[PDB]
């Protein structure tokens, strides 16, 4: 009974990191994209000026 | 009394020079940019993967 319940901890555990890295990769690209923007619009500001 | 302020000047052009040409007498030349050139270098650093 508790390596039964020892499993089903590690395969809940192993389900939300695996949720986790997934969420942090989208969030990683999201940040990529903005950051990239930015550098963008500093660049052509900079020009402009 | 200011080294930024003239820094930033420097980057307005000759345009001293064609003032001190009209005031001493002679008429300031009408044609395009033969002289000033609007270059840009780039050197924005790159991005961390």
């Given at each position: 009974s508790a390596l039964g319940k020892l499993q089903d901890v590690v395969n809940q555990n192993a389900q939300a990191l695996n949720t986790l890295v997934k969420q942090l990769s989208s969030n990683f690209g999201a940040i990529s994209s903005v950051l990239n923007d930015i550098l963008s619009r500093l660049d052509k500001v900079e020009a402009e000026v | 009394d200011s080294t930024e302020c003239s820094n930033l000047l420097?980057?307005?052009?000759?345009f001293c020079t064609q003032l001190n040409r009209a005031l001493t007498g002679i008429a300031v030349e009408q044609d395009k940019?033969?002289?000033?050139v609007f270059a840009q270098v780039k050197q924005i650093y790159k991005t961390p993967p």
């Amino acid at each position: 009974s508790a390596l039964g319940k020892l499993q089903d901890v590690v395969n809940q555990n192993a389900q939300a990191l695996n949720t986790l890295v997934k969420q942090l990769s989208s969030n990683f690209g999201a940040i990529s994209s903005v950051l990239n923007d930015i550098l963008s619009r500093l660049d052509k500001v900079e020009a402009e000026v | 009394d200011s080294t930024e302020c003239s820094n930033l000047l420097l980057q307005y052009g000759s345009f001293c020079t064609q003032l001190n040409r009209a005031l001493t007498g002679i008429a300031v030349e009408q044609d395009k940019n033969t002289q000033e050139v609007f270059a840009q270098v780039k050197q924005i650093y790159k991005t961390p993967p």
